[PDB]
Amino acid sequence: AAPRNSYENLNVPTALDFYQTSLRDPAFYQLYAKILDFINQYKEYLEPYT
Amino acid sequence: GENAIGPFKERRGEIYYFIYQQILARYYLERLSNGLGEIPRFNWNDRLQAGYYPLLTTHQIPFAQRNGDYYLANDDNIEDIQFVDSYEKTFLQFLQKGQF
Amino acid sequence: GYPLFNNNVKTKTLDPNLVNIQKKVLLLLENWKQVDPDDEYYKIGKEYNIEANIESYTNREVVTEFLSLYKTGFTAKNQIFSIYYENQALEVRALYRLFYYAKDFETFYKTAAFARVWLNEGQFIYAFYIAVIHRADTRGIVLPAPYEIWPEYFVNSDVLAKINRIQMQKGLILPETAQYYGVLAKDNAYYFYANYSGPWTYENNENLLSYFIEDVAWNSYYYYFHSKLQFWEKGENAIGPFKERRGEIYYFIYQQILARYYLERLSNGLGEIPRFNWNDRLQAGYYPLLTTHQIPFAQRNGDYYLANDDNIEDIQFVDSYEKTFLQFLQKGQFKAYKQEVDLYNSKSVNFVGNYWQANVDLYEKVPQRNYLRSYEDAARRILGAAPRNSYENLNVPTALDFYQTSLRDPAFYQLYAKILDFINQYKEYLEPYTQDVLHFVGVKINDVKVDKLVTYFEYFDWNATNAVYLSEQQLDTGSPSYIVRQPRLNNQPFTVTIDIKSDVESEAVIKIFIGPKYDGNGYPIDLENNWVNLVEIDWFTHKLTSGQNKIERKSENFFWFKEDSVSVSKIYELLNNGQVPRYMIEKFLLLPRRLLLPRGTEGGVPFQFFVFVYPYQAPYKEWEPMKEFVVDNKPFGYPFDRPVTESYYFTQPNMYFKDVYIYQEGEEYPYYTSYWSQ
Amino acid sequence: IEKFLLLPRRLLLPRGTEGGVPFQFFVFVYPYQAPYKEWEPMKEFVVDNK
Amino acid sequence: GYPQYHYDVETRKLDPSLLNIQTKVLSLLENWKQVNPDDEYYKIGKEYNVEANMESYTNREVVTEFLSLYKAGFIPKNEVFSIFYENQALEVIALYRLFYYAKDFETFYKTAAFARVWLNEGQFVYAFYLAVIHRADTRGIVLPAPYEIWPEYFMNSDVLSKIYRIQMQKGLIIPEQGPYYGILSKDNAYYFYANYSGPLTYEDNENLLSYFIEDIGWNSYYYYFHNRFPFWENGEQLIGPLKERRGEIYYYVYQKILARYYLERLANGLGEIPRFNWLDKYQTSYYPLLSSYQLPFAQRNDDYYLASGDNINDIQFIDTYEKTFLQLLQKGQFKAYKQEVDLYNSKSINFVGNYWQSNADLYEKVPKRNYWRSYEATARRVLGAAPRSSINYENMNIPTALDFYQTSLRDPAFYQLYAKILDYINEYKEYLEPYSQDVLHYVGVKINDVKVDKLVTYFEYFDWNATNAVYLSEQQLDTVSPSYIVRQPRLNNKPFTVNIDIKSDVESEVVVKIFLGPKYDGNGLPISLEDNWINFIELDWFTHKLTSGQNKIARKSEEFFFFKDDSVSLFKIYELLSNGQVPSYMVDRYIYLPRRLILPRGTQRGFPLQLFVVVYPYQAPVKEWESMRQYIVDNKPFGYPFDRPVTLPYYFNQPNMYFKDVYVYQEGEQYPYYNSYWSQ
Amino acid sequence: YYPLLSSYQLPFAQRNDDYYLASGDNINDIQFIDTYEKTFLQLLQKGQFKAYKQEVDLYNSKSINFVGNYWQSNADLYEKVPKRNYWRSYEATARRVLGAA
Ligand SMILES: *[C@@H]1O[C@H](CO)[C@@H](O[C@@H]2O[C@H](CO)[C@@H](O[C@@H]3O[C@H](CO[C@H]4O[C@H](CO)[C@@H](O)[C@H](O[C@H]5O[C@H](CO)[C@@H](O)[C@H](O)[C@@H]5O)[C@@H]4O)[C@@H](O)[C@H](O[C@H]4O[C@H](CO)[C@@H](O)[C@H](O)[C@@H]4O[C@H]4O[C@H](CO)[C@@H](O)[C@H](O)[C@@H]4O)[C@@H]3O)[C@H](O)[C@H]2NC(C)=O)[C@H](O)[C@H]1NC(C)=O
Ligand SMILES: *[C@@H]1O[C@H](CO)[C@@H](O[C@@H]2O[C@H](CO)[C@@H](O[C@@H]3O[C@H](CO[C@H]4O[C@H](CO)[C@@H](O)[C@H](O)[C@@H]4O)[C@@H](O)[C@H](O[C@H]4O[C@H](CO)[C@@H](O)[C@H](O)[C@@H]4O[C@H]4O[C@H](CO)[C@@H](O)[C@H](O)[C@@H]4O)[C@@H]3O)[C@H](O)[C@H]2NC(C)=O)[C@H](O)[C@H]1NC(C)=O
Ligand SMILES: *[C@@H]1O[C@H](CO)[C@@H](O[C@@H]2O[C@H](CO)[C@@H](O[C@@H]3O[C@H](CO[C@H]4O[C@H](CO)[C@@H](O)[C@H](O[C@H]5O[C@H](CO)[C@@H](O)[C@H](O)[C@@H]5O)[C@@H]4O)[C@@H](O)[C@H](O[C@H]4O[C@H](CO)[C@@H](O)[C@H](O)[C@@H]4O)[C@@H]3O)[C@H](O)[C@H]2NC(C)=O)[C@H](O)[C@H]1NC(C)=O
Ligand SMILES: *[C@@H]1O[C@H](CO)[C@@H](O[C@@H]2O[C@H](CO)[C@@H](O[C@@H]3O[C@H](CO)[C@@H](O)[C@H](O)[C@@H]3O)[C@H](O)[C@H]2NC(C)=O)[C@H](O)[C@H]1NC(C)=O
Ligand SMILES: [Cu+2]
């Protein structure tokens, strides 16, 4: 949700811009939950263990 | 992969999936312990429902703040939005093809 | 006040050999909601062991799969069953395969008794009905009509409440007043007058056509279509030689259904079928007054947003499934699902149809997949508006979850209109028919006349005893007859006379279609846009001699319509004389004749008839086992199976268009059923 | 130096309550099979070939 | 597995002069859904004519209006009745007025028989229950609990389906398989195990507290509150001596109902009650599994839009109403409905209450109006989400949980609506001057310590009779009805005692009040009194005599003023009547919350709460309030001292006040759904 | 508005584009705001009236005084009424709503 600009010399930092602060944002968890939901949809292909 | 992991180069995606799944599982356990329920899902064409007002600064520059009801698809994001959507749909198409 | 429907049934002698089987089948359909320990099947079911009889089934893999599934545990009794629930569908498919691969009738009967004794009643009845429809040894046997097997799916909550009250009271406490509440006691039976749903259930004036969309036979036709050609069965085991024409059948049936619905809407002045956007909200409210096991059906408000937090995934899939198809239209010739597809060729229709049904035939060339998805299933789930839950033991039923109640929901019509719009976008590829194919040299239709077209409402009685639970005494000796008497649309007999001239003596095929003349806006519809709204009503052959010819075709002989089914009591009465209702054996998958014409008005509603005469060509050889549903080698819906681009080059001397008016006699509305109105 | 990429032990269990929060443990025993040869340089993060 | 409820009933001897009325009443409530021609009431009602006995009613206009409406025609039998349906409301009000003004019990019985024989069953039962509660010559008799009069409004569809199947089959075809489906055949009766609603009905994890919001006692308490203080009746008939406090009562009850509810939300970690905007999509969905006459209850889909064109008019009225109140807050002193109002005075509360109930007392000084509209009724209609055709057409209605006082508390939207109303009322309350030290400080009295025993909650089986839900055969009516008993888990708390130590310099009479409240909010932070004054629930209120020196007061939870015992079943009522005794609580304490619902459960198995104890001087109520002594302990306003906002909390750090922190624990199963055959 | 301002290292509130002001949490405030505006319009229809125990005639230019005070919710607006423990300001409520904190 940072302001969008085409200038490379001006940025407003966000928690998701750094791996040191990514886990502080719930949006991180929601996004990667979506990604893992897609990956589990893929995993549905695999044959279950016998 | 060669310069970062070496012989475990063909298992990179497995590591990615395992680490992220473990992180999300621990987060879900903490939520259950605090009685917050499951992780919400969201729609890109709809608005995110997670407000965040970090009290963080670097070089005195404040971190970005997001309100409770933030519309993700605005005038200046359309392009990015489109890409995201496409990147998802292609994957679904792969699931229909199986072998490709 | 309306006249009471009485008509003798055209019956045919039954082969004595099958007689016993008939009996047994009926014995397995009596009070299927309850298990009676005193019945014969109970001991057989409690003692039968499938594994010990593994040699009695032709295929061994089916038995192994069924046993493996049964080891895990099937669904409990007294629970709602739906083919759209994944686990229940998986179990019922195995049960049906076990029924289908039984060596002989004795093994099948033993397996059915076992299933009824041990398994869920809904799964058992579904599988048994389908198997009896499909099993070769049971071919030629009469089955009860669907509305008599699942009465609760074909009547509203008030009538069922009255019936349940009568059953609980074991009669009337103050009989002389029951008449004032639409309950008549007569001839060892109880008759319950019933109304159709009103504006409370349907919004935007849709309730005006409730007499049509809620008709018992209208929904029974869709259930029969599902049973004969089920999406989860391979083409070989369901249709045989007409396996490459499955998509054509799908498209034809759905197009005819939507065309008839549009004709009814025009007759009621409701306009065209609305279109909707998935990312936007549906604008069709529905509040069904239906219940199964007292569990209410899902309700949808007027302005329902389809894309919520718990549906996103499904939504995405739907969108993708559409876009891929559009991409195919851009490619034209491609390779999908290990199958080469060329859209320039008409036969590709098959693929298209399967693609939009996600049936097993679509995946016959790829390895067995554990990842399963269906566009129609996801669309039905989204449109049903039922609460979303991840628990498999809790469901809120919706009208779209059952083929017996799907046609009651406008969302069904809207969704399949969207699907057929995509299919017509595909059809735009095909080359239009040319004059040489259409013109019938030496044949000209001089005239066409039709008698007065009349529609009315008449009382119809159907048995609804299976909806209640009987007592031990009733099971042992006899149960009462709870009969629902409701108004239904019907039309008086009419004849079509065709005057033709042909100096050449030859064999020919005549087709008759009925269609609209004006759209919702009151303007005439050009053939280039009306080709998709024409309903085929007749299809026959005739030998033309040199000179003049006059053909008289009666409405009782039309190919695409049947007569009404009869109750079980008459079936037993005829069976006692070695006879069966011929139309319940012959042409039991077609629409009833009473729904041929849309309800008219006092002044008259305008429509048109299209008559087409073309050369005859015999159906192919390998098509011999199915030479009771076809008349020639032309595609279904010919010549309107592909778009008409120029009406000038389509019209020929051997084609005729006539304008007709449909009138209404008696009451215009069907709700005049009160004690004071009789 | 050793195991500096893993989670701390202090975060192993979710915070409990005075009355107690319910969870479950799953214990699985299976046959052992040694990791592959070319996997030798990384035989400090794995225990078998699964 | 859960234990079975066993408890002793407090009984009092019944006046011998009332032995005839009681029976008669209990005879007219038997199988009220059906009319038996073999009964005496049938003949009496068939032959009785109202006009010929016009002299037997005190008021003559009542008879004339009833005759006019009856000539116009009442609703037919076998249809859903609701007091919110305007025509049905008029008819039932006329019938009740005819019942109430009957000069003697004999005429009342004849009129009741006539109504049962000729009129709709629902209207008859509603009016008869109200009249028995309000008639002077019926004071002292006992009525069956609401859940036994309307079983279908207190159970889900599955249990009702099982009961109907058993009734239709007249038993079990295969008895051995009954237990596997929750049906037990024992002692000539059939017991059906009942669950509570699950996530299908409630979203956002609210089903966790279903056991509380679907409890029979909760809805029965709401229905009793409605019956004792109907909105359409004049205050004088309802409350004679303390009519001017009607609005205050309206504020006291709802404020309690929400507060307890809020407490439960804190016990299950659900947070605060949501607020909503009328002109925006409603985010709370509801899918009730309830049905009346097999007609399903209306279902509200998530994100339902309330401001559609069809409802627009109603919306406007709602908005206007709210706006008007705010304007009044700016005026302070004004005249409304020909009543002078000054908001600087606490008495004005009365008016405020009436204003938000749209009751008769609000329009007592204006000429009789043919135009009338209720804010609560309009809001209930809007939030019900029933199709507009149901509203427009009179001979058809789809029932909603908000159309009945027996099922209103099941719908989450009720709590949000009344929270909005109470927010407006508290905005009004901000006018009042806060209590000073002089009124709060009891010179010479100091509380030394407050001790409390262990607070424990648990689920236990409770059986209630649901025979009235089914239709009986002629033989059953003649000889005896079947017994269908619903067995369901219910919350309960073990007995506990509060011990208070007080040091007094002088001897005097004092009044002691005990309140309960929460400690932490949804976000886990402590709640200051300035915001917690509205969340405290009044538990006990009693007088005492303090002698000079040290004194100890032991108060048992079984003696709290604001709670009652559980109502007894019909068979036990007959058993006690045959011995000339009646349950006292059902006689005169039925308007109080059940004692089993005092404490929350808690999903973490341990929940922190706080108790507040206050002692103040005793002053006898004014004499004119003589016939209300059983319900008033002193002259202080209800909820005192937490009846007005607290601005400076350090005024409540008085010697005669004490705050204590306590913990509530759970014993046994944490959840109530472990009631299967294999778990029992 | 994304101010780069801070007091005691606490960042100033940032208002995202397309911020919705009529959420449930603010609904009460919104209503008050609306009501206030509505009231003024009603006064314009009355022309001459009495508000806060002050006689006002809008045909006179002097009335400007009252109008100003009415839109500032200052002390002079409530000088003729008894001291009120209940007080709310249109400007303060609007500032709170638009601040997006
Ligand atoms: C209020 O709500 C609660 C909450 O839902 C309800 O409580 C539920 O009630 C149902 C039905 O009463 C319970 O289901 C039953 O559970 C039985 C106990 O099984 C346990 O042991 C077996 C091994 O013996 C385990 O397999 C079970 O679970 C494990 O296995 C399942 C297999 O699917 C897995 O899914 C699990 O994850 C576990 O790994 C339990 O640990 C069980 O015996 C019983 O099963 C019979 O019936 C089912 C019906 O589908 C068959 O599939 C199965 O093969 C068994 O066959 C019987 O079927 C019928 C009888 O129904 C007859 O032909 C025979 O008797 C035959 O033996 C069934 O599944 C559920 O466990 C329970 N949930 C709880 C307590 O949390 C209350 O009922 C409800 N109350 C009311 C009044 O509505
Ligand atoms: C399918 O849907 C249709 C349409 O909704 C529905 O038709 C309606 O049926 C109801 C009955 O259920 C009809 O209501 C009755 O109408 C008759 C006739 O009324 C006409 O004629 C009288 C003069 O004779 C006019 O005054 C009147 O305005 C009409 O023009 C009435 O006679 C009935 O009145 C009795 O019942 C009322 C309660 O319903 C009482 O209020 C009234 O006083 C009457 O009481 C009678 O019974 C009492 C109880 O036993 C007894 O005590 C009294 O002494 C008296 O005998 C009633 O109003 C309605 O008109 C129909 N509408 C239409 C358009 O046809 C079907 O019933 C429905 N079918 C099913 C199966 O559901
Ligand atoms: C669940 O709920 C159901 C329904 O509420 C309960 O069933 C009820 O049980 C009670 C207690 O058993 C019943 O009341 C008793 O009924 C008996 C039987 O009465 C019948 O038989 C009599 C001859 O044996 C006959 O005279 C009666 O008819 C008289 O009365 C009617 C009016 O009721 C009148 O119209 C007639 O003209 C007659 O005058 C009737 O046909 C009865 O003997 C009992 O009376 C005793 O007690 C009363 C009160 O103390 C006293 O006055 C009497 O003198 C006598 O001592 C008593 O009335 C009730 O009828 C049942 N209801 C139904 C619908 O059947 C069930 O018990 C509950 N189960 C639980 C809680 O587990
Ligand atoms: C409505 O449906 C019910 C149930 O299907 C019908 O009851 C059924 O009637 C048939 C024919 O009478 C019964 O079969 C016969 O049973 C006798 C023994 O009673 C036997 O001798 C005959 O050979 C024949 O099998 C059947 O048992 C019975 N079912 C039940 C559950 O009682 C009813 O007749 C139907 N009514 C109408 C009007 O169609
Ligand atoms: Cu929601």
mmCIF file with all atom_site columns, all heavy atoms in Angstrom, chain C residues 60-70:
data_model
loop_
_atom_site.group_PDB
_atom_site.id
_atom_site.type_symbol
_atom_site.label_atom_id
_atom_site.label_alt_id
_atom_site.label_comp_id
_atom_site.label_asym_id
_atom_site.label_entity_id
_atom_site.label_seq_id
_atom_site.pdbx_PDB_ins_code
_atom_site.Cartn_x
_atom_site.Cartn_y
_atom_site.Cartn_z
_atom_site.occupancy
_atom_site.B_iso_or_equiv
_atom_site.pdbx_formal_charge
_atom_site.auth_seq_id
_atom_site.auth_comp_id
_atom_site.auth_asym_id
_atom_site.auth_atom_id
_atom_site.pdbx_PDB_model_num
ATOM 1  N N   . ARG C 1 60 ? -13.463 -58.258 -11.769 1.00 0.00 ? 60 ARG C N   1
ATOM 2  C CA  . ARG C 1 60 ? -12.936 -58.449 -10.423 1.00 0.00 ? 60 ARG C CA  1
ATOM 3  C C   . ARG C 1 60 ? -12.470 -57.142 -9.794  1.00 0.00 ? 60 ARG C C   1
ATOM 4  O O   . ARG C 1 60 ? -12.545 -56.983 -8.571  1.00 0.00 ? 60 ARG C O   1
ATOM 5  C CB  . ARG C 1 60 ? -11.779 -59.454 -10.445 1.00 0.00 ? 60 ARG C CB  1
ATOM 6  C CG  . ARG C 1 60 ? -11.067 -59.603 -9.105  1.00 0.00 ? 60 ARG C CG  1
ATOM 7  C CD  . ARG C 1 60 ? -10.086 -60.767 -9.095  1.00 0.00 ? 60 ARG C CD  1
ATOM 8  N NE  . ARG C 1 60 ? -10.756 -62.059 -9.207  1.00 0.00 ? 60 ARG C NE  1
ATOM 9  C CZ  . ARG C 1 60 ? -10.860 -62.770 -10.322 1.00 0.00 ? 60 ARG C CZ  1
ATOM 10 N NH1 . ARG C 1 60 ? -10.340 -62.350 -11.466 1.00 0.00 ? 60 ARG C NH1 1
ATOM 11 N NH2 . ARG C 1 60 ? -11.499 -63.935 -10.290 1.00 0.00 ? 60 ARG C NH2 1
ATOM 12 N N   . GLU C 1 61 ? -11.987 -56.201 -10.607 1.00 0.00 ? 61 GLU C N   1
ATOM 13 C CA  . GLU C 1 61 ? -11.504 -54.937 -10.061 1.00 0.00 ? 61 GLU C CA  1
ATOM 14 C C   . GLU C 1 61 ? -12.632 -54.155 -9.398  1.00 0.00 ? 61 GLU C C   1
ATOM 15 O O   . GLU C 1 61 ? -12.417 -53.492 -8.376  1.00 0.00 ? 61 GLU C O   1
ATOM 16 C CB  . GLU C 1 61 ? -10.839 -54.102 -11.157 1.00 0.00 ? 61 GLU C CB  1
ATOM 17 C CG  . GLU C 1 61 ? -11.638 -53.974 -12.445 1.00 0.00 ? 61 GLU C CG  1
ATOM 18 C CD  . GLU C 1 61 ? -11.265 -55.030 -13.469 1.00 0.00 ? 61 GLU C CD  1
ATOM 19 O OE1 . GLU C 1 61 ? -10.841 -56.132 -13.061 1.00 0.00 ? 61 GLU C OE1 1
ATOM 20 O OE2 . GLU C 1 61 ? -11.392 -54.756 -14.682 1.00 0.00 ? 61 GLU C OE2 1
ATOM 21 N N   . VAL C 1 62 ? -13.840 -54.217 -9.961  1.00 0.00 ? 62 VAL C N   1
ATOM 22 C CA  . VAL C 1 62 ? -14.968 -53.506 -9.363  1.00 0.00 ? 62 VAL C CA  1
ATOM 23 C C   . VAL C 1 62 ? -15.255 -54.043 -7.967  1.00 0.00 ? 62 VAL C C   1
ATOM 24 O O   . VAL C 1 62 ? -15.497 -53.274 -7.028  1.00 0.00 ? 62 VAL C O   1
ATOM 25 C CB  . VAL C 1 62 ? -16.210 -53.600 -10.271 1.00 0.00 ? 62 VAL C CB  1
ATOM 26 C CG1 . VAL C 1 62 ? -15.915 -53.011 -11.642 1.00 0.00 ? 62 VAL C CG1 1
ATOM 27 C CG2 . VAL C 1 62 ? -16.684 -55.041 -10.392 1.00 0.00 ? 62 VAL C CG2 1
ATOM 28 N N   . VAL C 1 63 ? -15.237 -55.368 -7.807  1.00 0.00 ? 63 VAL C N   1
ATOM 29 C CA  . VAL C 1 63 ? -15.500 -55.959 -6.497  1.00 0.00 ? 63 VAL C CA  1
ATOM 30 C C   . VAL C 1 63 ? -14.427 -55.545 -5.502  1.00 0.00 ? 63 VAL C C   1
ATOM 31 O O   . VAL C 1 63 ? -14.724 -55.202 -4.351  1.00 0.00 ? 63 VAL C O   1
ATOM 32 C CB  . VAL C 1 63 ? -15.600 -57.493 -6.612  1.00 0.00 ? 63 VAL C CB  1
ATOM 33 C CG1 . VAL C 1 63 ? -15.936 -58.107 -5.261  1.00 0.00 ? 63 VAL C CG1 1
ATOM 34 C CG2 . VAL C 1 63 ? -16.637 -57.886 -7.654  1.00 0.00 ? 63 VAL C CG2 1
ATOM 35 N N   . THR C 1 64 ? -13.161 -55.579 -5.923  1.00 0.00 ? 64 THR C N   1
ATOM 36 C CA  . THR C 1 64 ? -12.073 -55.189 -5.033  1.00 0.00 ? 64 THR C CA  1
ATOM 37 C C   . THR C 1 64 ? -12.218 -53.734 -4.603  1.00 0.00 ? 64 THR C C   1
ATOM 38 O O   . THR C 1 64 ? -12.056 -53.402 -3.422  1.00 0.00 ? 64 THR C O   1
ATOM 39 C CB  . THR C 1 64 ? -10.726 -55.418 -5.724  1.00 0.00 ? 64 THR C CB  1
ATOM 40 O OG1 . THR C 1 64 ? -10.588 -56.804 -6.061  1.00 0.00 ? 64 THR C OG1 1
ATOM 41 C CG2 . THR C 1 64 ? -9.574  -55.006 -4.820  1.00 0.00 ? 64 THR C CG2 1
ATOM 42 N N   . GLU C 1 65 ? -12.526 -52.849 -5.554  1.00 0.00 ? 65 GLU C N   1
ATOM 43 C CA  . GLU C 1 65 ? -12.688 -51.437 -5.226  1.00 0.00 ? 65 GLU C CA  1
ATOM 44 C C   . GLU C 1 65 ? -13.857 -51.224 -4.273  1.00 0.00 ? 65 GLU C C   1
ATOM 45 O O   . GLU C 1 65 ? -13.751 -50.458 -3.306  1.00 0.00 ? 65 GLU C O   1
ATOM 46 C CB  . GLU C 1 65 ? -12.883 -50.627 -6.508  1.00 0.00 ? 65 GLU C CB  1
ATOM 47 C CG  . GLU C 1 65 ? -11.684 -50.654 -7.445  1.00 0.00 ? 65 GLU C CG  1
ATOM 48 C CD  . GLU C 1 65 ? -12.029 -50.213 -8.855  1.00 0.00 ? 65 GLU C CD  1
ATOM 49 O OE1 . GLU C 1 65 ? -13.182 -49.789 -9.083  1.00 0.00 ? 65 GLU C OE1 1
ATOM 50 O OE2 . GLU C 1 65 ? -11.149 -50.295 -9.737  1.00 0.00 ? 65 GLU C OE2 1
ATOM 51 N N   . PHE C 1 66 ? -14.984 -51.897 -4.525  1.00 0.00 ? 66 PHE C N   1
ATOM 52 C CA  . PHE C 1 66 ? -16.139 -51.746 -3.649  1.00 0.00 ? 66 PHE C CA  1
ATOM 53 C C   . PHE C 1 66 ? -15.828 -52.239 -2.244  1.00 0.00 ? 66 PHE C C   1
ATOM 54 O O   . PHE C 1 66 ? -16.208 -51.599 -1.257  1.00 0.00 ? 66 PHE C O   1
ATOM 55 C CB  . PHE C 1 66 ? -17.341 -52.497 -4.221  1.00 0.00 ? 66 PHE C CB  1
ATOM 56 C CG  . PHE C 1 66 ? -18.540 -52.489 -3.316  1.00 0.00 ? 66 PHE C CG  1
ATOM 57 C CD1 . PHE C 1 66 ? -19.424 -51.424 -3.326  1.00 0.00 ? 66 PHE C CD1 1
ATOM 58 C CD2 . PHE C 1 66 ? -18.776 -53.542 -2.450  1.00 0.00 ? 66 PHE C CD2 1
ATOM 59 C CE1 . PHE C 1 66 ? -20.524 -51.414 -2.491  1.00 0.00 ? 66 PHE C CE1 1
ATOM 60 C CE2 . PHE C 1 66 ? -19.874 -53.536 -1.614  1.00 0.00 ? 66 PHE C CE2 1
ATOM 61 C CZ  . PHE C 1 66 ? -20.749 -52.470 -1.635  1.00 0.00 ? 66 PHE C CZ  1
ATOM 62 N N   . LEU C 1 67 ? -15.146 -53.380 -2.130  1.00 0.00 ? 67 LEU C N   1
ATOM 63 C CA  . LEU C 1 67 ? -14.792 -53.895 -0.812  1.00 0.00 ? 67 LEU C CA  1
ATOM 64 C C   . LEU C 1 67 ? -13.837 -52.953 -0.092  1.00 0.00 ? 67 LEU C C   1
ATOM 65 O O   . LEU C 1 67 ? -13.974 -52.720 1.115   1.00 0.00 ? 67 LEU C O   1
ATOM 66 C CB  . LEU C 1 67 ? -14.180 -55.290 -0.947  1.00 0.00 ? 67 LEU C CB  1
ATOM 67 C CG  . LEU C 1 67 ? -15.146 -56.419 -1.313  1.00 0.00 ? 67 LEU C CG  1
ATOM 68 C CD1 . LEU C 1 67 ? -14.384 -57.692 -1.649  1.00 0.00 ? 67 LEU C CD1 1
ATOM 69 C CD2 . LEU C 1 67 ? -16.129 -56.668 -0.184  1.00 0.00 ? 67 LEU C CD2 1
ATOM 70 N N   . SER C 1 68 ? -12.860 -52.401 -0.815  1.00 0.00 ? 68 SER C N   1
ATOM 71 C CA  . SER C 1 68 ? -11.932 -51.460 -0.197  1.00 0.00 ? 68 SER C CA  1
ATOM 72 C C   . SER C 1 68 ? -12.662 -50.226 0.315   1.00 0.00 ? 68 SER C C   1
ATOM 73 O O   . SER C 1 68 ? -12.384 -49.744 1.419   1.00 0.00 ? 68 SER C O   1
ATOM 74 C CB  . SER C 1 68 ? -10.846 -51.066 -1.197  1.00 0.00 ? 68 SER C CB  1
ATOM 75 O OG  . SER C 1 68 ? -10.049 -52.184 -1.547  1.00 0.00 ? 68 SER C OG  1
ATOM 76 N N   . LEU C 1 69 ? -13.599 -49.697 -0.475  1.00 0.00 ? 69 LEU C N   1
ATOM 77 C CA  . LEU C 1 69 ? -14.375 -48.547 -0.020  1.00 0.00 ? 69 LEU C CA  1
ATOM 78 C C   . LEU C 1 69 ? -15.244 -48.906 1.180   1.00 0.00 ? 69 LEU C C   1
ATOM 79 O O   . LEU C 1 69 ? -15.367 -48.115 2.123   1.00 0.00 ? 69 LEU C O   1
ATOM 80 C CB  . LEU C 1 69 ? -15.234 -48.004 -1.161  1.00 0.00 ? 69 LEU C CB  1
ATOM 81 C CG  . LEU C 1 69 ? -14.532 -47.079 -2.158  1.00 0.00 ? 69 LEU C CG  1
ATOM 82 C CD1 . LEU C 1 69 ? -15.455 -46.732 -3.316  1.00 0.00 ? 69 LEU C CD1 1
ATOM 83 C CD2 . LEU C 1 69 ? -14.049 -45.812 -1.467  1.00 0.00 ? 69 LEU C CD2 1
ATOM 84 N N   . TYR C 1 70 ? -15.859 -50.089 1.163   1.00 0.00 ? 70 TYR C N   1
ATOM 85 C CA  . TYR C 1 70 ? -16.743 -50.480 2.256   1.00 0.00 ? 70 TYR C CA  1
ATOM 86 C C   . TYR C 1 70 ? -15.970 -50.698 3.550   1.00 0.00 ? 70 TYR C C   1
ATOM 87 O O   . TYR C 1 70 ? -16.502 -50.454 4.639   1.00 0.00 ? 70 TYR C O   1
ATOM 88 C CB  . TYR C 1 70 ? -17.520 -51.740 1.875   1.00 0.00 ? 70 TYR C CB  1
ATOM 89 C CG  . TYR C 1 70 ? -18.682 -52.045 2.792   1.00 0.00 ? 70 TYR C CG  1
ATOM 90 C CD1 . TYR C 1 70 ? -19.845 -51.290 2.743   1.00 0.00 ? 70 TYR C CD1 1
ATOM 91 C CD2 . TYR C 1 70 ? -18.621 -53.093 3.699   1.00 0.00 ? 70 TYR C CD2 1
ATOM 92 C CE1 . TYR C 1 70 ? -20.912 -51.565 3.577   1.00 0.00 ? 70 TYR C CE1 1
ATOM 93 C CE2 . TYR C 1 70 ? -19.682 -53.377 4.536   1.00 0.00 ? 70 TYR C CE2 1
ATOM 94 C CZ  . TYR C 1 70 ? -20.825 -52.609 4.470   1.00 0.00 ? 70 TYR C CZ  1
ATOM 95 O OH  . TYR C 1 70 ? -21.883 -52.889 5.303   1.00 0.00 ? 70 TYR C OH  1
#
